[PDB]
């Protein structure tokens, strides 16, 4: 599996991936990663508002991963997430866009190879429309992050759509809006598919 991570936003985005690291992308720049077979628990995300020194150490306003350009850890919300697990189940990759850790930048997460043709987008103006309760510098947090209750965070295994997850779900129906939003947010492709993650598609 190859992932082509493309910045189509009219501002610099510091792509991040675990596994993969990170890369500063001006508009139109891309970054190709090649996660190992069977990678799981993986993410790709955009970061905005970054200032890094020449060693790649500093801070991002959104999606910061322990202050590194080359991420080895997940990012600080809010950050729009491309999540994937290669060869997760019955020879299928399972992939999704998640807003469970908020939204910073619009995203497409789609297969590029001919064996899979259905992908995922989240392109609404979530930052502009974000509930004031959820706003954070550079983005729009999920209520689980903000309020940290079972109702939003699903630790008990029960939860559902809430007013604040519905904000996201109405706008990006194909993305996870809350942890257990599986039924309408789980995408699959045959193992061996290649993908793209596009910021501001």
Q: Which residue has the tokens 């392109």?
A: 123
Q: Which residue has the tokens 């689980």?
A: 144
Q: What's the CA gap between 34 and 5, in Å, rounded?
A: 11
Q: What's the CA gap between 58 and 122, in Å, rounded?
A: 28
Resolution in A: 1.0
SS3 label, residue 167:
helix
Which alpha helices (H) appear in the chain, and where do they start and end?
Answer: 126-129, 143-147, 150-153, 163-171
The answer for residues whose C-beta is within 8 angstroms of residue 194's C-beta and 6 or more apart is 1, 2, 3, 4, 111, 112, 113
In order of 57, 72, 78, 149, 186, the CA distances from 69 in angstroms are 6, 9, 17, 31, 29
**Domain locations in the chain?**
1-201
Starting at the edge strand found earlier in the chain, the sheet holding 30-33 runs 30-33, 3-7, 195-199, 107-111, 120-122
Q: What's the CA gap between 48 and 94, in Å, rounded?
A: 26
Q: What's the CA gap between 120 and 182, in Å, rounded?
A: 14
Tokens for 12? 């610099």
Residue 38 φ/ψ, nearest 5 degrees: 75, 5
Tokens for 66? 């322990």
The CATH code of domain 1-201 reads 2.60.110.10
Residue 189 φ/ψ, nearest 5 degrees: -140, 155
Determination approach: X-ray
Q: What's the CA gap between 115 and 109, in Å, rounded?
A: 15
Could you tell me where the beta strands, DSSP code E, fall in 113-164?
120-122, 135-136, 139-140
Q: Which of 177, 181, 176 is nearest to 167 (CA)?
A: 177
Could you tell me where the beta strands, DSSP code E, fall in 81-161?
81-89, 92-98, 107-111, 120-122, 135-136, 139-140
Q: What's the CA gap between 45 and 172, in Å, rounded?
A: 16
Question: Rounded to the nearest 5 degrees, what angle is found at the Cα of 95, between the Cα atoms of 94 and 101?
Answer: 130
Q: Which of 187, 34, 58 is nearest to 119 (CA)?
A: 187
């Amino acid at each position: 599996a190859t992932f082509n991570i493309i910045n189509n936003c009219p501002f610099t985005v510091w792509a991040a991936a675990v596994p993969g690291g990170g890369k500063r992308l001006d508009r139109g720049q891309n970054w190709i990663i090649n996660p190992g077979a069977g990678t799981k628990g993986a993410r790709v995300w955009p970061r905005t508002g970054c200032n890094f020194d020449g060693a790649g150490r500093g801070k991002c306003q959104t999606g910061d991963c322990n202050g590194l350009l080359q991420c080895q850890a997940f990012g600080q919300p809010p950050n729009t997430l491309a999540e994937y697990a290669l060869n997760q189940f019955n020879n299928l990759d399972f992939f999704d866009i998640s807003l469970v850790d908020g939204f910073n930048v619009a995203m497409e997460f789609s297969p590029t190879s001919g064996g899979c043709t259905r992908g995922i987008k989240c392109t609404a103006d979530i930052n502009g429309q974000c509930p004031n309760e959820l706003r954070a510098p550079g983005g729009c947090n999920n209520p689980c992050t903000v309020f940290k209750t079972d109702q939003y965070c699903c630790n008990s295994g029960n939860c559902g759509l809430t007013n604040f997850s519905k904000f996201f779900k109405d706008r990006c129906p194909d993305a996870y809006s809350y942890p257990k939003d599986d039924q309408t947010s789980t995408f699959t492709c045959p193992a061996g598919t290649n993908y793209k993650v596009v910021f501001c598609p």
